[PDB]
Amino acid sequence: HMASIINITELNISGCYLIESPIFSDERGEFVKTHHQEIFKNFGLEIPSAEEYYSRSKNNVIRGMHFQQYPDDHNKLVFCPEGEVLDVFLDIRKDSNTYGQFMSFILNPHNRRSIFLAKGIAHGFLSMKDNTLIVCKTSTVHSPSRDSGIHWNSFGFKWPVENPIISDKDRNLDCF
Amino acid sequence: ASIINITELNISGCYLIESPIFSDERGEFVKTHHQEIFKNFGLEIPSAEEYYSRSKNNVIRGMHFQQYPDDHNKLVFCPEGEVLDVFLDIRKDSNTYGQFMSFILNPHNRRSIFLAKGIAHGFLSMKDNTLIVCKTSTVHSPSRDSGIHWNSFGFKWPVENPIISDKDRNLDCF
Numbered sequence A: 001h002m003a004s005i006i007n008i009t010e011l012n013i014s015g016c017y018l019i020e021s022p023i024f025s026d027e028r029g030e031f032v033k034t035h036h037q038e039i040f041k042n043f044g045l046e047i048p049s050a051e052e053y054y055s056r057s058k059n060n061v062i063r064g065m066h067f068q069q070y071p072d073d074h075n076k077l078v079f080c081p082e083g084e085v086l087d088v089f090l091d092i093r094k095d096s097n098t099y100g101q102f103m104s105f106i107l108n109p110h111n112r113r114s115i116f117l118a119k120g121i122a123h124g125f126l127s128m129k130d131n132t133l134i135v136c137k138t139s140t141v142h143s144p145s146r147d148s149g150i151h152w153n154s155f156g157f158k159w160p161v162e163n164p165i166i167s168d169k170d171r172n173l174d175c176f
Numbered sequence B: 001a002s003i004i005n006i007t008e009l010n011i012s013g014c015y016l017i018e019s020p021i022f023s024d025e026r027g028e029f030v031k032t033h034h035q036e037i038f039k040n041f042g043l044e045i046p047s048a049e050e051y052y053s054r055s056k057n058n059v060i061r062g063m064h065f066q067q068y069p070d071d072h073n074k075l076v077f078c079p080e081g082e083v084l085d086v087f088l089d090i091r092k093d094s095n096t097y098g099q100f101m102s103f104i105l106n107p108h109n110r111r112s113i114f115l116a117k118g119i120a121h122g123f124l125s126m127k128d129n130t131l132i133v134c135k136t137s138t139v140h141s142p143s144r145d146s147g148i149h150w151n152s153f154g155f156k157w158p159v160e161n162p163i164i165s166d167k168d169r170n171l172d173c174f
C-alpha cells in the first residue's frame, strides 16, 4: 500500500471505514489529503456533502451517541485536525450482523485518521484535549424531527474518564 | 446572526460565507455548510476533493488554480490560527479581470471563502499552526495545475521574508 495516497480500510462493522490520510511536509508546514472522490468510489462511497460543521471541545467532554432516524438517516464523515478524541461508534441497525457491537479509534492530527460511518450508526466521542476540533460531514441535513440518540454509558463501553462533561440533552438520551 | 450568511463579492462568482456559532459548557460548534442555504444562492459545495494545510507563521502559498477543462470551484475556511486570504480574477472575459481581493479568515470571524472557476487563490499565514480546510469541485489534475506568481499582481503582502516553496517562487508572473 502506498503511503502517498489516501488509504481506506473497511471495518468489521460493515459500511464503516477507517480512512488514513497521507501527509506532505516541508519548511512551510504540512498538507494532508482527506478526501478524493475516485478513491472513495472504489468502496462504493461518496463524501457526505449535505452539511458540514466543526466542533471545538474542552478536555473531558463526551458528545453522543448521535444518529438520525430513517428516512433522514445519513452517512457521516469525521476527522480531527487539532486536539484529540476517542471516537466511538455503535451499530444500532437491527438487521445488521454486528448489531449492538461498537468500535473505537483515537483520532488526531498525528495519525490523520478519518472515520466514515454508515446510516444507522450511533456516533460519539470523548475529547482528550482542550481546543479539540472535529470536522464533521453528513449526507443529509440535520432533521430535528428525526434527530435521535443513545446514552453514552448504556451500550457496554468503558469510557476512560471521570466526571465527563456532557450536555443535559445527551444526559437524557435513552439507554440502548 | 444565527444562520449561515452568504454574500456575493466584487469579483463575481466568489462569495463570503459567514458561519454562526453555538456555545455551551462543552465548547462550540460552527456550521460551515448547508446544501439548502447554498442552493438558495445557486451554489453547491465543492465535493470532489478535500485537504487541509497547516502553516507556520509568515508562509505564503499560492497563487493557484486549475485550467479548463479541469477548473474548479474552491471553498476554504480557517478553524485555527489566521490567514489573509487573497484571490485574483484571471478570467479574461471578466469585468474584474486583473483585480484582487483579500480577507482575514480565522476562527473568531468564522469566515469562509467560495471561489469560482478561473480565480487564482493564495494566502499568507499570520500565526503558527494555522489550519486551512480546502475543498475543490474537481480532483487535482497535475497537467492543469497552474499558478500565478504571488508577487506579480499588485498586492502588498504585509510580511517581510515570507516562507515560500521553490515551486511557488518560480510561477509565471501575471
Ligand SMILES: Nc1ccnc(=O)[nH]1
Pocket (backbone or CB within 6 Å): A033, B051, B140
Ligand atoms: N491533491 C492535491 C491538491 C492540491 N495540491 C496538491 O499537491 N495535491
